[PDB]
Design an enzyme around this catalytic site. Structure first.
Site, PDB file in Angstrom:
ATOM      1  CE1 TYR A 195      17.881  13.055  23.430  1.00 51.54           C
ATOM      2  CE2 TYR A 195      17.415  15.160  24.522  1.00 51.54           C
ATOM      3  CZ  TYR A 195      17.863  14.433  23.422  1.00 51.54           C
ATOM      4  OH  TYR A 195      18.300  15.115  22.326  1.00 51.54           O
ATOM      5  CG  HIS A 224      15.224   8.082  18.122  1.00 49.20           C
ATOM      6  ND1 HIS A 224      15.575   9.391  17.886  1.00 49.20           N
ATOM      7  CD2 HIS A 224      16.270   7.528  18.773  1.00 49.20           C
ATOM      8  CE1 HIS A 224      16.782   9.620  18.368  1.00 49.20           C
ATOM      9  NE2 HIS A 224      17.228   8.502  18.910  1.00 49.20           N
TER      10      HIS A 224
END
Length: 333
Positions: free
Chosen positions: A172, A323
């Site tokens: 991430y 997402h």
């Protein structure tokens, strides 16, 4: 604040017409029945934007998804789990046939955080999978506290330890923030640290063991839209490059990483001109229904592993997050 090169690319104009010219609609090269479980691995990556938030809106989100998809490893980001809550964490989002390792963010509560699922049959045992957190290689099952922001979780895979090595890095990447405020952090601290680690992993897989079923797969939410068509067009090109993810330095740094580490955005190797294909849709607008979003989620693979990749595609019907997941298949002997 910003170098001459960056400034030049910021001022130059490009109309929607002239970047979406050569762009063709996305048609997935495979159907789900091409998947051969005996000679392929399925990897998926998914930014869930709050694991608890997701599972609270639907307790079975992970159960139903794993069942339907049976992925060999699933990489999640933005779990937003808190680091002191090990027990609450280890019982959250459990699924039969799977082990998971957590790497929750320490430096801020309910933020960032990273988790990887491994299928017990194929991955835990068949691939002898071990994990580390942060920018660490293994010892000679998880290892090290890792980076304080919970951004990097690596799974090491081989059919025989000590042959074919793959390092799958669940990542991430740090967002440059609303004002491009944390852009200097992304570009000067994070990206260079990521570059170094990827090189070291590639040397772990390669110069140790040995085009070749050895290298790294850098998967996750890389917070960058690298093609001009990797995000919807609105306003001016100048104004577009002011949003985090599309800043000139972000794009050049990512290109540089792929270059310096000898790896490829596998989606753009299979569909170099396809669009619009996005993996992210801002909730700040009503983005999803109108399909104006960004492609922020990636599988970046060592060059020498590129040819083993059968397909790589988004899964835009899978809801619960801002997402969608991204899926990838890899051939193996």
């Amino acid at each position: 604040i910003r170098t001459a090169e960056a400034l030049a690319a910021l001022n130059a104009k490009k109309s929607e017409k002239e970047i979406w010219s050569d762009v063709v609609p996305f048609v997935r090269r495979t159907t789900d029945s091409d998947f051969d479980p005996s000679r392929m691995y399925k990897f998926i990556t998914w930014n869930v934007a709050g694991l608890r938030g997701l599972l609270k809106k639907n307790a079975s989100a992970l159960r139903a998804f794993m069942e339907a998809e049976k992925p060999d490893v699933l990489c999640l980001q933005e779990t937003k789990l808190n680091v002191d809550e090990a027990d609450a964490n280890a019982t959250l989002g459990v699924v039969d046939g799977y082990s998971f390792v957590d790497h929750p963010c320490a430096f801020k509560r309910g933020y960032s955080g990273t988790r990887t699922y491994m299928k017990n049959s194929t991955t835990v045992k068949g691939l002898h999978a071990r994990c580390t957190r942060g920018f660490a290689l293994p010892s000679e099952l998880v290892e090290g506290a890792g980076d304080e922001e919970g951004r990097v979780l690596t799974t090491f895979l081989s059919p025989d330890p000590d042959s074919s090595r793959i390092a799958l890095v669940n990542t991430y990447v740090a967002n440059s923030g609303m004002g491009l405020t944390r852009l200097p952090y992304r570009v000067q601290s994070f990206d260079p640290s990521m570059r170094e680690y990827l090189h070291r992993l590639d040397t772990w897989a390669t110069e140790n063991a040995a085009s070749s079923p050895h290298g790294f797969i850098w998967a996750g939410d890389l917070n960058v839209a690298e093609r001009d068509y990797d995000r919807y067009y609105a306003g001016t090109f100048k104004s577009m490059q002011e949003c985090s993810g599309f800043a000139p330095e972000e794009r050049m740094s990512f290109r540089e990483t792929m270059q310096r580490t000898n790896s490829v955005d596998i989606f753009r190797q299979l569909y170099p001109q396809a669009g619009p294909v996005y993996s992210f849709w801002s909730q700040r607008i009503n983005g999803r229904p109108r399909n104006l979003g960004w492609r922020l989620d990636y599988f970046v693979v060592s060059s020498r592993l590129a040819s083993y990749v059968v397909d790589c595609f988004p899964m835009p019907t899978v809801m619960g997050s801002d997402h969608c997941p991204f899926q990838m298949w890899m051939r193996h002997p």
